[PDB]
Amino acid sequence: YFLEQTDSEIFELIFEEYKRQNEHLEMIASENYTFPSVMEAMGSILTNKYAVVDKIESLAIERAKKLFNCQFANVQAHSGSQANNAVYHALLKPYDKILGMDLSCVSLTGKHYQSFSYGVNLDGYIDYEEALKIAQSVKPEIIVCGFSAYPREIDFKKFREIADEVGALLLGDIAHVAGLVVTNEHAHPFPHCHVVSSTTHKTLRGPRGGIILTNDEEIAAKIDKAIGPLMHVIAAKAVGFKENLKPEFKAYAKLVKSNMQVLAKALKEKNHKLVSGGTSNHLLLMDFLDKPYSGKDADIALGNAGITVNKNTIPGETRSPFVTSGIRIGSAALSARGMGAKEFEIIGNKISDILNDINNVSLQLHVKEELKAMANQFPVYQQPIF
């Protein structure tokens, strides 16, 4: 209750963000609402500690090993991106080659690496035969899989078959589907991957941060060497992991997926096209190649109606990368608010109504009022500070 009295300007900014989170429909596939108990840990007196291993870090590691079903965890990475870079820094030599995904049909981090891409077929699925052919030619030291805008499951087993044929390490970046992995609602990356990286936020609903997992003791030792401990953040990760182990979190992961199925079905019944024909996870991609509006146009129109999505290039893209021909839409945040099939059906029909009359501003403003009323039936938080 201090800020309410001691810092009017910060309190106003927090309160307006709290109101914004509560009153609009967050459908950016990477966004989510952290658990209240995670924020309590983030705001705890553990921030004063330390300006061989704290019990709190051992507990975070123990819970991670159980949650991710692996023998070793490092919980010190500040982000999923730092987690990936620490893996490269630990396992690669200068000018080693990295083969990773992009959604199409030289780089430094202290050390210089050579970067290569594989992609999707014209139907929007990873082309594993072509990824193998690229690997055979490129001969990468490490193959990475996992991708922020892919609406289907990663076949880690097949990627390991490729990695084994060319003698590559395999890194599974599960940052974008982690809450589905740890609830057995997405194919598991182990034992196929030599090493796995993830964020702790997004579909896991923990604090902002990264993590690195492995079953190989020598990889684990190298990771520990390549990576100031923030004890409140490590505690917050541990808090999130214990929430993630509960049966309620499996029910949440199933709702994330079923809400996506409801949304996909509603859109396809209104004759909208989806990349790959639908989804098997937390996100879909709408396909506007044959529409007179762009992904950017749709992003803005839906945003005016209180629905946040993001534009996204799609396979066969014919528009510029700043404009794009698609939008990415996710269910994780609204599912965390308790919204379900009835709500996702209404949202699908409203998205269809706007895309079918995309410059009708009064329609957008009408929809915004209706969906704000829906949001207020499913409040996110009863307070802005925990």
Added chain:
Amino acid sequence: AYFLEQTDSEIFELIFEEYKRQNEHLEMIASENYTFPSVMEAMGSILTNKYAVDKIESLAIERAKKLFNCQFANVQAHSGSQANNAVYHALLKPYDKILGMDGKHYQSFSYGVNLDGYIDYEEALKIAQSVKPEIIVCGFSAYPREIDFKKFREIADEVGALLLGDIAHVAGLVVTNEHAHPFPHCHVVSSTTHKTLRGPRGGIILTNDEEIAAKIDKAIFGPLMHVIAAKAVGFKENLKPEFKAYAKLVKSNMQVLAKALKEKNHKLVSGGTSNHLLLMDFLDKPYSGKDADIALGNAGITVNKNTIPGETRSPFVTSGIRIGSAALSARGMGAKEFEIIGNKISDILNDINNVSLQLHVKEELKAMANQFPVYQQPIF
């Protein structure tokens, strides 16, 4: 607080145990402190959900400009260490030379203190004239006197060097005009936001040069809005008259401590202090700094061993201890307490193997600590 107490008793117990630890021992490590409660409230806010330049970042920057009396601020560094590194990365090229106090390949050179414990500025000038460093760094974590930023800029100007002032260890004294200011002498200034500023764990880089500011911004460029808000909250607290009183108390408690120790005939590096810390000198005593560290720790007084000028023992053993007043001053302790503490420190040092005495002192100081609670809750 509520949720964790019900939903995760194991983590809640660990928080409570650490809350008791903070309250029950006398924290005198010069770099430790207790963050403002309002800063932890920002840290535990819903701002963590934003973005998986914001008005929150602009407010943090504007408050930093006012607080540090400068034209530009970058508030993104995650630590004092990252802040220094970003300065080097932004302003230096490989094999450039860095003169500081004792794929980039920066080459490091050192100046030191005379045997009286003061920075030797004549020798630092001689070294700079010969080596011609591209950058000079000043500020130091175990130095009990004020940095002469003006003299360092005279040296840097002689050789055409940049001057970085690392104020991480004295920042709360600087911004209250209780320590010489680094500007306009320094081209660039780095600091932590915790320690004597009592904000969150984090870093900051300040400058008055637009070109340097542009390079800093490119060099450090995931924004953690709860952390940036927390820095902003701390800076506003640092601007209050209450915070200048706190800085004066930090310094006056250190004077009380040094006076008490010297009057019991203990020796101090440079004979005293002008800031938040002192160094005790055990070169002529049969016990080591490690001995003193352990013995005082067993009495509930937390210090750290530290090498001193003329060190003759192993660097893992040392002939001194570093003692600071910032954390106990933040709990509200004053001269009466620091006189008692100085006396008990003396009693233990004069009988360093009396373990019964250490345990007896620990119980005695428990009542004093209980009089000055750090906080009234473990979660904000």
